[PDB]
Amino acid sequence: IQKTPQIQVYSRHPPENGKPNILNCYVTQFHPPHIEIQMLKNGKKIPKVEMSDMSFSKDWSFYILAHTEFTPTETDTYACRVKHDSMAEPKTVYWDRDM
Amino acid sequence: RGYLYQGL
C-alpha cells in the first residue's frame, strides 16, 4: 500500500512581523514511512529544524511534525518541501500567513 | 516504561 502525505504548514500564533513565533510543517497520512522533509526560508533550507510528534493513525498511516522558531518579516517567505515515494516529484508547500 | 516485545 502507498499513501501520499498531507503537508500542512502553519505557525504557533498569528503572524506578527518582528514577533517571535514557531513555524510547523505537519506531514500526515503517508505510507511507506520513508520521507524527506525540508523547511525552507527564502528558498534556503533551514538548519534549526526539530522533528517531533511521530505517530500513526488507526489506518496505520504515519504522522510527523517538523517545526522551527522564527520571527516573521514582511519580505520573508517560508515553505516545506517533501519527498515521498508516492510523489516522484518533490512537493513544496508554501506558508500562507493569511489563511 | 516500554515493553520488551516478543518475536513473531
Partner: protein, 274 residues
C-alpha cells in the same frame, strides 16, 4: 478524566543500506515524553518532556538496554515475515506496533492494548480480554500459536495491568504540572472571497491543551457538520494544538453563520461570527 500511556514502535528495513531503522516513541496522553531512534549518532533512550528529568540515570540505562534488545528482535522479525510471506530480500518492509493502557481519573486500569501491523495492514492483536489474540491472516496465525505456546499473553497482561499502569501514574504525578493542565483555545474567523459571489469562512482555534476539541459551524441553530471542512487537530510545536473548520456561504450572508468551540478550557462554549 482518563489518561493513557502509549508507545509507537516502527521497524523498517532498507536492503542495501544497512540495518533496518528502529524507532520508539512514547506518549503520556497527547504529549511526547520519550523516544529512541537507531539512526541517532549514539542511539539511546532520551527524555522528550521536561518533567522526565525527574527520572534517575538508571531509568535511561534500563530503557536504552531494552530498546536495543527490541531493535535486534525486530530486525529478526522482518527476516521472519519475509519467510512467512515468501517475499524477496530486496524490498523494504514495515512493522508497526502500538501498545499502551488507559486509566480513569482515579488511576484504575480502564483498558490495555497491543496491535501489530505489517506493511500498513493489521497483523495480530491482543483482544480486550487481554488473554487472547486475533490474527489478520495465516502469517499472523503462525505468530499466534508461537505466542500461545510461550505464554506471551500472560507476560503481556502482567505488563499492561502491572508496569504500564503503575508507571503511567508516576508519570502523571511527576509531570502533573504539565499533563494535568488545561490551555483554553483562542479563536478567530477569517474571510476569503470566492469566484461565484461565494465567501469562505474559516474558524481558527489555537493554543489549547488537551488536544480534544469540537468546532461546529451553525446556521439557524442547526449544525452544518455536513457541509463543514476541517483539518485534524494538530501539534503547534510547543505542546499545544490548533485546528480550523471552514464553511462556504453566500456572499452577504456571513452574519447568519456562527462557529461554536467546545473545550475543557472553555467553561462555556465559544460562539463566533464574522
Amino acid at each position: 478524566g482518563p489518561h493513557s500511556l502509549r508507545y509507537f514502535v516502527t521497524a523498517v528495513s532498507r536492503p542495501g543500506l544497512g540495518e533496518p531503522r528502529y524507532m520508539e516513541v512514547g506518549y503520556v496522553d497527547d504529549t511526547e515524553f520519550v523516544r529512541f531512534d537507531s539512526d541517532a549518532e549514539n542511539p539511546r533512550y532520551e527524555p522528550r518532556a521536561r518533567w522526565m528529568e525527574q527520572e534517575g540515570p538508571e531509568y535511561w540505562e534500563r530503557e536504552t538496554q531494552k530498546a536495543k534488545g527490541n531493535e535486534q528482535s525486530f530486525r529478526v522479525d522482518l527476516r521472519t515475515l519475509l519467510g512467512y510471506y515468501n517475499q524477496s530480500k530486496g524490498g523494504s518492509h514495515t512493522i508497526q506496533v502500538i501498545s499502551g493502557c488507559e486509566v480513569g481519573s482515579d488511576g484504575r486500569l480502564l483498558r490495555g492494548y497491543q496491535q501489530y501491523a505489517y506493511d500498513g495492514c493489521d497483523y495480530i492483536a491482543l483482544n480486550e480480554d487481554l488473554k487472547t489474540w486475533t490474527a489478520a491472516d495465516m502469517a499472523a496465525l503462525i505468530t499466534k500459536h508461537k505466542w500461545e505456546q510461550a505464554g506471551e499473553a500472560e507476560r503481556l497482561r502482567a505488563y499492561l495491568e502491572g508496569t504500564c499502569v503503575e508507571w503511567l501514574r508516576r508519570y502523571l504525578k511527576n509531570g502533573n504540572a504539565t499533563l494535568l493542565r488545561t490551555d483554553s483555545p483562542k479563536a478567530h474567523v477569517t474571510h476569503h472571497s470566492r469566484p461565484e459571489d461565494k465567501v469562505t469562512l474559516r474558524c481558527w482555534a489555537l493554543g489549547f491543551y488537551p488536544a480534544d476539541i469540537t468546532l461546529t459551524w451553525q446556521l439557524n441553530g442547526e449544525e452544518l457538520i455536513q457541509d463543514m471542512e476541517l483539518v485534524e487537530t494538530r501539534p503547534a510545536g510547543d505542546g499545544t494544538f490548533q485546528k480550523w473548520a471552514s464553511v462556504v456561504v453566500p456572499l452577504g450572508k456571513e452574519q447568519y453563520y456562527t462557529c461554536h468551540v467546545y473545550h475543557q478550557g472553555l467553561p462555556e462554549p465559544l460562539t463566533l461570527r464574522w
